[PDB]
From Swiss-Prot, chains A, D:
Cytoplasm among keywords: yes
An example molecular function term from Gene Ontology annotations: acyl carrier activity
Name assigned to this protein: Acyl carrier protein
O-(pantetheine 4'-phosphoryl)serine PTM sites in chain numbering: 36
Keyword Translocase among record annotations: no
SUPFAM superfamilies for this protein: ACP-like
Localization, UniProt: Cytoplasm
Entry-linked InterPro entries: ACP, ACP-like_sf, PP-bd_ACP, Ppantetheine_attach_site
Family statement drawn from the similarity comment of this UniProt entry: Belongs to the acyl carrier protein (ACP) family.
UniProt keyword list: Cytoplasm, Fatty acid biosynthesis, Fatty acid metabolism, Lipid biosynthesis, Lipid metabolism, Phosphopantetheine, Phosphoprotein
PANTHER family cross-referenced by the UniProt entry: ACYL CARRIER PROTEIN (PTHR20863), CARRIER DOMAIN-CONTAINING PROTEIN (PTHR20863:SF76)
Record gene name: acpP
GO cellular component terms listed in the entry, alphabetical order: cytoplasm; cytosol; membrane
Swiss-Prot record, chains B, C:
Organism whose genome encodes this protein: Escherichia coli (strain K12)
Name of the molecule in the record: 3-oxoacyl-[acyl-carrier-protein] synthase 2
The gene coding this protein: fabF
Pfam families in alphabetical order: ketoacyl-synt (PF00109), Ketoacyl-synt_C (PF02801)
Positions that bind platencin: 269, 306-308, 339
Segments forming domain Ketosynthase family 3 (KS3): 1-410
Gene Ontology MF term list: 3-oxoacyl-[acyl-carrier-protein] synthase activity; protein homodimerization activity
Length: 77, 411, 411, 77
């Protein structure tokens, strides 16, 4: 049902922001009001939704909507 | 001596989501107990509780922040917000260090402890939420309220099981009277109607099992009583130094004139008998207020609907009130709300305060046949209009734990 | 004004199972941190903690009663028994109502919450132990001690996370000073080194992960610090009204002269910056004791080995001590014991008391390279002999929570 | 390894009494110092050891060592 759409949906409900605000270039901390524990909780929600395990060193690089999209992109097939 | 008055009230209860709606339902004798339906109760010996109905905090707590809070934290915040708004207090940089909180709970966040432990058992430690600890520990109601209102004064959280409510209110007044604060938000919150709560109190054989008639299950001092009924909710009071309150033109519900404590020094598996611990807490409250028992018009009992505990409490009242025991009014609002555990003493302080304002006393419903030796006036069935009542007594008794009593005075 | 003195000490810590053995190990700079081995830590980012070694309570708590107690309750009881025996107090029917307890915990019984919930998930509510609730809630240390010694005085249990220890001791003194008691046993107990504890604090990214060198992990104010280290144990003090203590010929370790509290009113996910909340708690303690900061010789810091919190605490000390900040001694015994959470303030009050008795200050070990702007005397590496020291300050800071400070005075 | 022996062993460790004191005629409350929650915990331990379910109405009749023996006796084969 589209991974980009699915990722933005997760980010939107996790950070409590409307879908209009979840742009590809938005950073979780600077743009969508997340704190450092919100970011941890968001990565976990992404892990749960896509049944994947994101290592700690890679999770730390997922700081924007695009990075989350690109990560879930290149870890399926 | 710095006097302490009540300037704001907030409440969520099984019979109402505001102070006035709860108070009206209680005076009408309405039961808040119903069958649990938020988890499968098939294997549970007790299938009902006093639940908060139609709870909606979305205008106060965003859905993002709700996910970081067990239900009891959400209740406590909403009740605290009600109390702060009712008090009309304006918090400034100048007075922020003089305003604090004393808010506790008996069990805390059982719901989210279950959820995170289930996550741990199914997926290992990487499935535990980062908010697990702050979403569950008892001091987090005070934590969130102090941040929401910018409070910088003394903040504590007393967790003394079924007497947490009176202990937090009483020690909020001590802090004010000592001079460490001018205003304190105090009370308690509870949400134990979870698989671990109902199963845990049911494992201890402490709960009523009258699943066929849940609204008749809580019957303090009735011969057919068979244990207490769980209830959820929160009560919050805004306590204020008297001169501070008058200077800003606050509304003043009552004065808190007495606070007493004691310990039973016996396990609850041992016979309560005469209620000596409960009597000592009441006696200390009377001494602290400098009044005699005969001046108390109404006692909001502990009255949990347990066989041995209800009888021992009746003996404690007889001991303290002596000749006046036949005249004093006693009632248990737990007959309608169930036992709110750590929040019980908080909502019941509110009931004792409003009894002074309205000169009316809520009933002990379901008291169809009192026990032999339970010959006090328990205000059965129907509320009682009174006049000239100037002092009320609010009790929380551990019967195998700690005890607390508060005395409120009119105007 | 009723003065409050310390007449008994009891302690279990990662570096010793008595007061004197713990104190000797700390003065020698000994670390109590080691690899966890009581559960499989393979999936845990943090694999070590400060554990109580070779704990043996069989002479105090029968195996039957141990099964009804989470580990933190067992620690608290043993430390409390040590304190009562050290005080030499004789409890009678005449004085029983004048002796109480103020004993808390930050997390309570995580171990037995896990065990009973696992039983629930595998077998349904009929597998929950009847002792589940009394084996886990935080007020049960006070509950068992009051029953064991027949104490009937005021009993409370403050659960304010990492400041529970100082809050319980401070309010035990308030209760005595107010006149509600003549003696109080006060302190805290903690055992959070469980799958839910390590995983829960690890989920919040708050723990050090230096699994390769656990004894070097706790390094307050060191540039290489990376979070706090969990520790287990309990500290108990017997507080007594001064004239009561002298009349019975008690040993008197110190006088408790000051107690201050505050709230931060900010989430911990927000920058601590200047430590204004910690400074307010210290300032209130100084006002309560009626002394200036320049009279404090030693500060037992909070010093958890967290990046932002250690720096904010250093700013709070600079604010309070001003010109005297360069001269005052500051140290974190958490560098050796780890963070005992709700019991931290209790064992650290004991360290502050014994520093006055022995005129020696324990070091901050592992402080190899202090941060820029962490230019105070942190007593690195080796204990410091002192002379003429008359006042010590014991701090517990929430940095996103509540704050508490106690001031002790020699003789 | 003998159900009578097994039952007495469970009772002994549950109630913290030496095996010499766990006689067939001993009652848990009057003789072996149990309280009402100890009795609940003891019945649960018996359920766990013999992989059986003891209903509430029958559990209440298990008040002595002999009653516990007789119950586990007539609920195996």
């Amino acid at each position: 049902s589209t991974i980009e759409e699915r990722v933005k949906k997760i980010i939107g409900e996790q950070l409590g922001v409307k879908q209009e605000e979840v742009t590809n270039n938005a950073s979780f901390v600077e743009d969508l009001g997340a704190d450092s524990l919100d970011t941890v909780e968001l990565v976990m929600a992404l892990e749960e939704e896509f049944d994947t395990e994101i290592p700690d060193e890679e999770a730390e690089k997922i700081t924007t909507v695009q990075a989350a999209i690109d990560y879930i992109n290149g870890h399926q097939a | 001596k710095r006097r302490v008055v009540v300037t704001g009230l907030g409440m969520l209860s099984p019979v109402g989501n505001t102070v006035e709606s709860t108070w009206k339902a209680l005076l009408a004798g309405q039961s808040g107990i119903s069958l649990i339906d938020h988890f499968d109760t098939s294997a549970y010996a007790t299938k009902f509780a006093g639940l908060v109905k139609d709870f909606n905090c979305e205008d106060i707590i965003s859905r993002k922040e709700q996910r970081k809070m067990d239900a009891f934290i959400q209740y406590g915040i909403v009740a605290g917000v009600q109390a702060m708004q009712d008090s009309g207090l304006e918090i400034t940089e100048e007075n922020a260090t003089r305003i604090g909180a004393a808010i506790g709970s008996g069990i805390g966040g059982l719901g989210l402890i279950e959820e995170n432990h289930t996550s741990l058992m199914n997926g290992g430690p990487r499935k535990i939420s980062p908010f697990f600890v702050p979403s569950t520990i008892v001091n987090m109601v005070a934590g969130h309220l102090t941040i929401m209102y910018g409070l910088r004064g003394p903040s504590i959280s007393i967790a003394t099981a079924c007497t947490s409510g009176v202990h937090n209110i009483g020690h909020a007044a001590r802090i004010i009277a000592y001079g460490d604060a001018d205003v304190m938000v105090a009370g308690g919150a509870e949400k134990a109607s979870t698989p671990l709560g109902v199963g845990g109190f049911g494992a201890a054989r402490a709960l009523s099992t009258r699943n066929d008639n849940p609204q008749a299950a809580s019957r303090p001092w009735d011969k057919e009583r068979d244990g207490f009924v769980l209830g959820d909710g929160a009560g919050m009071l805004v306590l204020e130094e008297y001169e501070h309150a008058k200077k800003r033109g606050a509304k003043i519900y009552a004065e808190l004139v007495g606070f007493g404590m004691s310990s039973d020094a016996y396990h609850m598996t041992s016979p309560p008998e005469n209620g000596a611990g409960a009597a000592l807490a009441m006696a200390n409250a009377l001494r602290d207020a400098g009044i005699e028992a005969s001046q108390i018009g109404y006692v909001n009992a502990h009255g949990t609907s347990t066989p041995a505990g209800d009888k021992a409490e009746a003996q404690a009242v007889k001991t303290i009130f002596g000749e006046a025991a036949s005249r004093v009014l006693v009632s248990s609002t737990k007959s309608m709300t169930g036992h709110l555990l750590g929040a019980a003493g908080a909502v019941e302080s509110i009931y004792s305060i409003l009894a002074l304002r309205d000169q009316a006393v809520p009933p002990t419903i379901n008291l169809d046949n009192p026990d032999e030796g339970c010959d006090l006036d328990f205000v059965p069935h129907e509320a009682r209009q009174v006049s000239g009542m100037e002092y009320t007594l609010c009790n929380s008794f551990g019967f195998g734990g700690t005890n607390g009593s508060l005395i409120f005075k009119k105007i």
